[PDB]
Copies of this chain bind each other. A is one copy, B any other.
């Protein structure tokens, strides 16, 4: 049985912007993926609202630095056959840094953290790694969000090509989330239930391919 860790942010937690709540379990993209793989895989969802690739954010009751937390998560869930990353939307906040390029460097650090992890028990081989570019940000009239993410429509559109290029450099899998799903203008960043499911459905082929099914 293959074990798949899904390491993400609110898009992976399953933020429902319509209701200001959480999508149902069955609508979260790791759950869609699990259903599709069935008993051949065990998928673990680790989605944290506001998680950045590598940067500190002290505005919530959690540690939002993806890189600082990842070793603890890897160790909790080892041994792992596949890590699926979907991060970068929070990196588009100017407070964090706002740059597509800083997001791709953060993913690079996360890839290295997986590759160099000191596993809890003796482990022959590195997990495989799938880098997913999140669905790009959209324009919103929500004044708080448009400030929070000022300039991020334009920068977030550059994540797919950069993340694809990194995945090629680092021998990782790549999927463009924005190829199957769009964000909502309620806030410019979140996915409704249908678009969240779509990410899960869309990943099934590359996930199967990376796992040898």
- Tell me if A135 is interfacial: C-beta within 8 Å of chain B: no
Question: How long is the Cα–Cα vector from A121 to B14 in the complex, in angstroms?
Answer: 11
Q: A13-B120, A99-B94 are in contact. Are A62 and B54 (CB under 8 A)?
A: no
Nearest Cβ on chain B to A159's Cβ, whole angstroms: 13
Contact B48 A75 (CB under 8 A): yes
- Tell me if A177 is interfacial: C-beta within 8 Å of chain B: no
Question: How long is the Cα–Cα vector from A122 to B112 in the complex, in angstroms?
Answer: 13
Nearest Cβ on chain B to A94's Cβ, whole angstroms: 6
Question: How long is the Cα–Cα vector from A147 to B166 in the complex, in angstroms?
Answer: 15
Residues of B near A95 (CB, < 8 A) are 97, 99, 101-102, 105
The residue on B at minimum CB distance from A122 is B20
- Tell me if A21 is interfacial: C-beta within 8 Å of chain B: yes
Nearest Cβ on chain B to A15's Cβ, whole angstroms: 8
Interface residues in A38-75 (C-beta closer than 8 Å to B): 42, 46-49, 54-56, 58-63, 65, 67-69, 71-72, 74-75
Size range of the chain A interface in the assembly: 35 or more
Partner of A76, one of B1, B24, B47, B59: B47
Contact A58 B121 (CB under 8 A): no
Q: A60-B75, A61-B118 are in contact. Are A101 and B147 (CB under 8 A)?
A: yes
Q: A116-B116, A117-B116, A147-B99 are in contact. Are A109 and B76 (CB under 8 A)?
A: no
Contact B22 A79 (CB under 8 A): yes
Over the window 82-120 of chain A, the binary record of Cβ atoms lying under 8 Å from chain B Cβ atoms (1 yes, 0 no) is 000000000000110111011001101100100111101
Residues of B near A79 (CB, < 8 A) are 22
Contact B94 A102 (CB under 8 A): yes
Contact A144 B62 (CB under 8 A): no
Q: Report 20 cross-chain contacts, Cβ distance below 8 Å, ordered by A residue.
A: A1-B24, A13-B76, A47-B76, A48-B72, A54-B59, A55-B58, A56-B56, A58-B68, A58-B109, A59-B67, A59-B109, A60-B120, A61-B117, A61-B118, A62-B74, A95-B102, A101-B148, A112-B118, A115-B118, A116-B116
